[PDB]
């Protein structure tokens, strides 16, 4: 990884950790608590 | 445009340019217009229905039919002030992926120009994502454009990724582009208009 | 070992609750119409047998 200023910088395509929780509709800040709420949702 | 109000409507397509990028004066035709071929319009709510077991979230269109996200969209600004939380989560990553193009159409608006050096690499995502963060149901912050500083020498510009450009020539108030130089090499050489 | 008379009561009580089963896929259209179409929602249910 060489730091040259002309390297095409691209920001991450998918917004990090948006509240797309599968059934939880509660989103924890970290990725670990994001999938933990579907476990905390229902069985 | 001499009062910092640009007419026309704004676009958000992903244009990974390397040469001159003039957002306020598009040298091309606008990519699509309202009601064109495969150009659907978002509904009054902007509501996004999510589909299960790994399908795409579909977005409810003008005639209350859940059309899919990837493609083209005419997104009226009053819908954007009430559903910018559904924009920035679902339909905006499909802009940066380069698979959907939204014509966020507001008839008139105040604008802002962030100039930059085209030698150095720059992505116009956080300048634009800060603009999507200050949209309330009340108002919208002015539309931020990124125009390169016109260079005097033929430079080796970085490949940049810009998103916002308007539909019509909103470059009325551009008096000159390098008023103390022999000639503009790279940028938009707009001489003093007689 | 289940009683027959007790079973005839509890089989009625399931029929009492399955006579109240609003299927939850239509709760979206209830909220959309009870609010005079001023306010629409999306309620992702999880269909089970």
CA-to-CA distance for B11 and B174, rounded, in angstroms? 21
Other C-beta atoms lying within 10 Å of the C-beta of residue B134: 11
Entry resolution in angstroms? 3.8
Helix (H) or strand (E) holding B78: helix B77-80
CA-to-CA distance for B44 and B143, rounded, in angstroms? 22
> What sign results for the dihedral spanned by CA atoms B162, B163, B169, B174?
negative
Q: Do C44 and B45 touch (CB under 8 A)?
A: no
C46 touches chain A (CB under 8 A): yes
The answer to whether B132 and B92 are in contact (CB under 8 A) is yes
C42 half-sphere exposure, CB direction, 13 A CA radius: 16
Which contacts of A22-26 are long-range, i.e. CB under 8 A and separated by 24 or more positions?
A: A23/C44, A23/C46
N- to C-terminal Cα separation, chain A:
45
N- to C-terminal Cα separation, chain B:
18
Q: Pick from A5, A22, A10: which is nearest to B50 by CA? A: A22
C47 touches chain A (CB under 8 A): no
User: Which residues of chain B neighbour C41 with C-beta distances below 8 Å?
Assistant: 47
- The backbone torsions φ and ψ at residue A34, rounded to the nearest 5 degrees and listed phi first, read -80, -45
The answer to whether B8 and B171 are in contact (CB under 8 A) is no
Task: Give the residue from chain B lying closest to C40, CA to CA.
Answer: B45
Name the minimum distance, in Å, from the CA of B40 to any CA of chain C: 20
Task: Give the residue from chain C lying closest to A25, CA to CA.
Answer: C44
- The backbone torsions φ and ψ at residue B67, rounded to the nearest 5 degrees and listed phi first, read -75, 160
Q: Is B109 helix (H, G, I), strand (E, B) or coil?
A: strand
Q: Pick from B92, B100, B95, B93: which is nearest to B71 by CA? A: B100
User: Which residues of chain C neighbour A23 with C-beta distances below 8 Å?
Assistant: 44, 46
Q: Do B47 and C40 touch (CB under 8 A)?
A: yes
Bridge partners (DSSP) of residue B107 are: none
Name the minimum distance, in Å, from the CA of B49 to any CA of chain C: 6
Name the minimum distance, in Å, from the CA of C41 to any CA of chain B: 8
Task: Give the residue from chain B lying closest to C38, CA to CA.
Answer: B45
Neighbours of chain B (3+ CB pairs under 8 A): A, C
Q: Do C40 and B52 touch (CB under 8 A)?
A: no
Q: Is B23 helix (H, G, I), strand (E, B) or coil?
A: coil
CA-to-CA distance for B104 and B92, rounded, in angstroms? 12
Q: Do B52 and C44 touch (CB under 8 A)?
A: yes
Q: Do B48 and C44 touch (CB under 8 A)?
A: no
The answer to whether B145 and B24 are in contact (CB under 8 A) is yes
């Amino acid at each position: 990884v060489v730091s040259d200023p002309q390297s095409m910088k691209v920001t991450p395509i998918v917004n990090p950790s948006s509240y797309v929780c599968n059934v939880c509709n509660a989103r924890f800040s970290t990725m670990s608590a994001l999938s933990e709420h579907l476990r905390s949702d229902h069985r | 445009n001499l009062f910092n109000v640009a007419r026309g409507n704004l676009y958000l397509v992903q244009t990974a340019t390397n040469g001159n990028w003039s957002p306020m004066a598009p040298v091309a035709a606008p990519p699509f217009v309202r009601g064109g071929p495969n150009v659907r319009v978002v509904g009054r709510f902007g509501t996004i229905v999510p589909r299960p077991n790994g399908l795409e979230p579909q977005l409810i269109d003008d005639g209350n039919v859940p059309r899919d996200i990837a493609g083209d969209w005419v997104y009226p600004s009053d819908v954007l002030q009430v559903s910018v939380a559904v924009f920035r989560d679902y339909v905006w990553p499909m802009v940066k992926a380069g698979r959907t193009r939204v014509l966020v159409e507001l008839g008139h608006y105040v604008y802002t120009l962030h100039y930059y050096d085209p030698q150095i690499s720059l992505d116009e995502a956080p300048i634009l994502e800060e603009w999507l963060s200050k949209i309330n149901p009340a108002g919208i912050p002015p539309v931020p454009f990124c125009i390169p500083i016109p260079q005097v020498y033929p430079c080796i510009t970085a490949r940049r990724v810009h998103y916002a450009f308007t539909s019509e020539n909103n470059n009325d108030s551009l008096f000159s582009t390098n008023a103390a130089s022999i000639d503009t090499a790279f940028g938009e050489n707009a001489a003093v208009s007689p | 070992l289940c009683d027959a008379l007790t079973l005839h009561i509890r089989e009625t009580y399931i029929m009492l609750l399955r006579s109240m089963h609003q299927d939850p896929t239509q709760i979206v259209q209830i909220v959309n119409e009870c609010a005079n179409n001023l306010l629409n929602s999306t309620i992702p249910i999880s269909l089970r047998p």
